[PDB]
Symmetry: C4
Subunit: 330 residues, 4 copies
């Protein structure tokens, strides 16, 4: 083995991130304005815009969830708050019209109670929301939810970063699989634990397990630009979950912060010290970006441009697009 030792499997793959690839233009009769951006969030739920906001306390509460649903996407309400409060946020969203909404639950002692209260509040999607979904407790929770409330609620499981982990969630009954271990802008898992998987490779691997079973993949973490959304979908994901890109919007929780004449909002990992109240997230800030509606327009605009360049009339067509790998110089 050229990189050391005698075991070719020790270094199992070469992991590519978003910056490692570009989409190749292809024959097209699709104008960006005419592309259909709709896509499956879960087996049953199709969104007008293939974007969902992160279940983070500096990204998604009721205001964000309402704005995301109105924009054609969806919000996933964070779970760093009492069960009654999270449930009350679900009701607030549902009372602003027939709007889709999701909510995160963990696998701890109060997770089941949380899930049932969210169910009672009329949640559409439950997201089993963990740092490591390749584990029996997480798989059991997904399965139990699907068997209990699965007729009326779609159940997402995550996060994973390998084909095997995605396959396990599929077998457990997941209605979507969320991919991302290590890539988040505020994530320090890579440096604290030394663990992660570059996101393009993670998506390609998860999709290899999920697409044959008709289970959509949600690409979660590491998306810095609108072009990354196109790359994630072309790699085979069906939707993208955004934290950093939405944390600077008016609708996110938290106050405006003025530093050196410029406007920012705080954005922090759910595994940061402040969120926990061994951290694997940081507490930072992102530029203030104005209203969500405007940010979503720019993000969807970039996606539409990519669909035009690749001749992709639909997201399902975009999932078949090809990449060129680039070097450091590029």
């Amino acid at each position: 083995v050229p990189t050391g030792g005698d075991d070719p499997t020790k270094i199992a793959m070469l992991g590519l991130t978003f910056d490692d690839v570009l989409l190749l233009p292809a024959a097209s009769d699709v104008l960006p304005a005419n592309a259909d951006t709709s896509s499956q969030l879960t087996k049953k739920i199709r969104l007008k815009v293939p974007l969902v906001s992160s279940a983070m306390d500096t990204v998604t509460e009721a205001r964000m969830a309402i704005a995301m649903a109105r924009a054609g996407g969806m919000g996933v309400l964070h779970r760093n708050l009492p069960v009654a409060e999270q449930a009350a946020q679900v009701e607030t969203v549902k009372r602003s019209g027939g709007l889709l909404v999701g909510a995160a639950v963990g696998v701890g002692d109060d997770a089941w109670e949380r899930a049932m209260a969210l169910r009672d509040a009329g949640v559409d999607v439950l997201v089993v929301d963990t740092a490591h979904a390749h584990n029996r407790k997480v798989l059991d929770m997904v399965h139990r939810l699907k068997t209990t409330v699965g007729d009326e609620i779609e159940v997402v499981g995550g996060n994973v970063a390998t084909r095997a982990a995605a396959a396990a969630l599929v077998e457990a009954g997941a209605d979507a699989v969320k991919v991302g271990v290590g890539p988040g802008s505020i994530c320090t898992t890579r440096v604290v634990a030394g663990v992660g998987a570059p996101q393009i490779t993670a998506i390609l691997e998860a999709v290899a397990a999920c697409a044959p079973h008709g289970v959509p993949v949600i690409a979660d973490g590491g998306l810095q630009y609108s072009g990354d959304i196109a790359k994630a979908l072309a790699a085979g994901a069906s939707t993208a979950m955004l934290g950093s890109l939405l944390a600077g919007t008016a609708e996110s929780p938290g106050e405006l912060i003025l530093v050196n004449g410029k406007q920012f909002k705080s954005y922090r990992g759910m595994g940061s010290l402040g969120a926990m109240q061994v951290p694997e997230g940081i507490e930072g800030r992102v530029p203030f970006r104005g209203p969500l509606s405007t940010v979503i327009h720019q993000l969807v605009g970039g996606l539409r441009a990519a669909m035009g360049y690749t001749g992709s009339a639909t997201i399902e067509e975009l999932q078949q697009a090809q990449f060129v790998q680039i070097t450091a110089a590029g």
Copy 2:
């Protein structure tokens, strides 16, 4: 597949940019001063210097086109202005002697009218000038122009970044194919859409489709140094189109700008907000560089040096030169 999934074609190639390669010196009896720098702009039109200025409103109006033709190259007049005005600029150039001139047209509602007015004004080259030429509307426009005015006017189509797209333009009747999707200094297509093709690979691919049919390739975008011109031609292009490298000259449109004691000129993408009046270009500035004649001398000087080092007596010989690929460290 080492990079993920089970499809070896998903990541179709490894794309190299100018910075990824150097020209290897070879046996030479060619002194730089004795090299012949002439090259085909189109099937019929040969230039003394293999350089043309970008069809951009901060690069080429009549003054630039006149200076470029006098220097042995050519200007392509931008199309971000009324048809009558663009046509009047063509006439201004033609009235400054027997000077070659080109002009850009799009494929929109007024493109045909624009083309005919430019034809009437005595334009030598029509450049069908689009972000994505791999499309029936663009191919139809090239073909229609060639069948209508092709006896008296050479028709260039662009831009493309793949062998297949170049092949389509050849079939449509293009007299030259312009290559570049993503590499422009002011381009944000790569980050907005996630789309592009590193330019050395794009040129090698386009040339593979174009050279067998005797159709010259114009390398457009990403050229930062005179050495990049040599690299583009060695990769098989016949001419290079320059934006950034010429935007700082006296002959480009726009005022001098003084910032922090240094002189600059504004340079902006035609897909920037200001040019459009979802942007895929930025508005920036480039150092002021003085007269075009002087810039062209330096650029051609570097090209001549490369021709000497590679033993290339002509541009056709330079097109057969070899590269070494370099690493990040280099």
Copy 3:
């Protein structure tokens, strides 16, 4: 040969460092809090925490050795001081309870005398501590110590960076092999001598020689983050030796230094000018980090997280984990 010449062995391998790889998550029923972090320092000695402090005069004297042993690791007392003083430090440590302690010796004229005095003082581990252990004098010293005091004292040899060098130390009777030529944060061997071996590859190679003989590998140098400890162990090392990461602690030798409002401690290579009194180390500073106990908690916390993510119940299981290689972009 694509990189030059006609000898494929001239460039013998592609060397990976810590930053080149990440650990892949895997199926897990191991919670970080439940992982067993114990590991072999030497054939006979197992530590509660797989960490030992560097034998450097800005890292380990008696105070550090006592704190490291209490934290479940071990200190290796530096040898840049008179034999009597080093021996007295061993006694100071042993008089603070039944604490494990190691001490460095060289191979110079006074090395044997030093070793015997340390033996008399009750040292548990002798570390034959050299820049280049692939040499008969070093091998002889290891062998002589093992045959003379090997029943009561474990003998470590280092440093090496290749499979062959590790194999030689094993044959000589080493109870552990210490790996690291070039990677230290304060090391300039790479630039002064042009010599080194990227640490992940060095560990994989040394382990290939050592593991089949039941000899533990100590990964020494280049560890910048807690995640690097997990990577080193997953590459097959049994413990990690830390310099930079511990030099900023209260227990390290040396005063606090205030520069630009921030607190630091001096940290210097043992091959720096100041330590020698042709340098292959620098004299620098590292941020002040507070008490060792706290630093060790954070480092072990990150290790525990990695064990959870990789489904590793023990360090021996972690040694079987897999990596993904990452690119520059990642």
Copy 4:
């Protein structure tokens, strides 16, 4: 072809520079202090230290040549001055004892006259000193010198960057071949012409042509650290030529320059504007480094360390050492 087009030879090799490789430690019974650093400058001339100073007007005049010879190396007097003056510098050196000295000549109209005057002055080595030696005029000059004065004077030819060019110089009768096109610290050939060859690969290729004919290779350009000297020799070169590393010494031509409280000396390419009086060099400055004797001691010290680490008793043994290739992260 993964990088574009259908010709596998278009991108002929992957070029490595010094930063791309490290020397692997190997079995050693060689202490750095006991290594023999002598090496062939040319077929007949062996130096005590394998270093020669660049033929540049900010590096080598008589003072530098005298100091280099006394240190066990040699200086090559630059040729940017009248023939009589260069000849007078040769005599100045020869009058400071039995000191070896070289002098550069070109291939222009006055080159032969220059060579004969240098011959008359008692020069030991004539260096045919060009940007591109792969050319009949250069080959003819080398051959003519060797046939005319070759019994009493050793003739070096350069510079080359390929196996074929080195082979041509060997056939022409060169007593040494000098390698380096593109790597010089003050060189802009890479950006102006787009031409060059990463130096480790260039050396491996030149050596493949030269070593089988017993012709030493001088590695010229790109050496930034003492470790680069070891790498160049391990790649198969017999000596290293230094510009930047010696330009900051007391013995180099030019005044001390004080900028922002720090001392520098000017260092400029011989193809810079100022040296010429289309530039392919820049005019810069390097830190003041004090006396040559001290710089040479540090450089030879690093070389000796490498010889120790690689078990190389002589430079001929060092030429057989192995490398590990490193990544960007390393």
